[PDB]
Design an enzyme around this catalytic site. Structure first.
Site, short mmCIF file in Angstrom:
data_model
loop_
_atom_site.label_atom_id
_atom_site.label_comp_id
_atom_site.label_asym_id
_atom_site.label_seq_id
_atom_site.Cartn_x
_atom_site.Cartn_y
_atom_site.Cartn_z
N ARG A 3 -0.30 9.08 1.14
CA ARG A 3 -0.93 9.15 2.45
C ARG A 3 -0.14 8.33 3.45
NH1 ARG A 3 -3.65 6.15 -0.95
NH2 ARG A 3 -4.10 3.96 -0.49
N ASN A 4 0.70 7.44 2.91
CA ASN A 4 1.49 6.52 3.71
C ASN A 4 2.95 6.96 3.89
OD1 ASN A 4 -0.06 4.33 5.00
ND2 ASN A 4 -0.39 3.43 2.97
N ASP A 35 0.83 -1.20 0.00
CA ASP A 35 0.00 0.00 0.00
C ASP A 35 0.87 1.26 0.00
OD1 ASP A 35 -2.36 1.47 0.01
OD2 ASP A 35 -2.45 1.50 2.22
N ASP A 74 3.58 2.78 6.82
CA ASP A 74 2.36 2.01 6.58
C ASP A 74 1.44 2.30 7.74
OD1 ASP A 74 0.37 0.31 5.81
OD2 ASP A 74 1.72 -1.23 5.05
#
Ligand SMILES: O=C(Nc1ccc(Oc2ccncc2)cc1)Nc1cccc(C(F)(F)F)c1
Length: 272
Positions: free
Chosen positions: A138-139, A134, A152
């Site tokens: 945003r991570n 992912d 994460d």
């Protein structure tokens, strides 16, 4: 704990040594102080249905180390409630940052630097045969002097916004998810390369949501017959060419992170 003890874990630290605080709006991460060193830190915490999963994250974090990956300071998994301490990143997450920065201070060169840092972390993770799953702005987290680290959050359930939708046993950042992974649940380092390509885009546009306007349901179809985001305003031709290479329909075609970082180094050095 106790060195001679049979379950000695270097990482397990005194839960009292950390002055918990309030939430850093998220599981759940609060901000904390490590009294011993007067240092503000990030504390991730958990009667919930994913213990095997939390401790797994802990375990992993204990195996990874790199200047561009969020750094684990210690844990608290001897006695609940379960903790996970990592350094704090004053600037929060890369996506908001890009959306609330001073673009004069965060110019093209700076944006090229951020991509270089991220690529570097991924090359490591690729070398340690570890699959992010992912990767997205945003991570990633932001620190002093435009220092960027990959992280994460487990945003999956933290978020439901429109970022993530159901496919497999859960939710998936559709717009960041590669073809093969949307269609076969095949996640590889090549799948992360794809997402990187998108994250680039996020960077090129100071944090604009991917494939703007398009609805999740139709993303695959388009990509199927070879459609892609268009070069973002200001993005260098060489950066963009890169995104495309990441976005190739065939994983085996996508360049390795080793290659992706080698290309940035050359670009970032040529521009400063
Ligand atoms: O990143 C992880 N946990 C975590 C804890 C607290 C967080 O909050 C926060 C920290 C600092 N500063 C501000 C906020 C954010 C993320 N876990 C993780 C699992 C798997 C891979 C990785 C990676 F490869 F990315 F390193 C990381």
């Amino acid at each position: 704990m106790d060195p001679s003890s049979p379950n000695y874990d270097k990482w397990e630290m005194e839960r009292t040594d950390i002055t918990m605080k309030h939430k850093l709006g998220g599981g759940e991460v609060y901000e904390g102080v490590w009294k011993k060193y007067s240092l503000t830190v990030a504390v991730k915490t958990l009667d919930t249905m994913e213990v095997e999963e939390f401790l797994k994250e802990a375990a992993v974090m204990k195996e990874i180390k790199h200047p561009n990956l969020v750094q684990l300071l210690g844990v608290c998994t001897r006695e609940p409630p379960f903790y996970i301490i990592t350094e704090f990143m004053t600037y929060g997450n890369l996506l908001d940052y890009l959306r609330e920065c001073n673009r004069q201070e965060v110019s093209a060169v700076v944006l090229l630097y951020m991509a270089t840092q991220i690529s570097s972390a991924m090359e490591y993770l690729e070398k340690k045969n570890f699959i992010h799953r992912d990767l997205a702005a945003r991570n990633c987290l932001v620190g002093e002097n435009h220092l960027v680290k990959v992280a994460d959050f487990g945003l999956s359930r933290l978020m439901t916004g429109d970022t993530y939708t159901a496919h497999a046993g859960a939710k998936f950042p559709i717009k960041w998810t590669a073809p093969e992974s949307l269609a076969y649940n095949k996640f590889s380092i090549k799948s992360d390369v794809w997402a990187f390509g998108v994250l680039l885009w996020e960077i090129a546009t100071y944090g604009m949501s991917p494939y703007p306007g398009i609805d999740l349901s139709q993303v695959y179809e388009l990509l199927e017959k070879d459609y892609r985001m268009e070069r973002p305003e200001g993005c260098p031709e060489k950066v963009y060419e890169l995104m495309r290479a990441c976005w190739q329909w065939n994983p085996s075609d996508r360049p390795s992170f080793a290659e992706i970082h080698q290309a940035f180094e050359t670009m970032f050095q040529e521009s400063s």
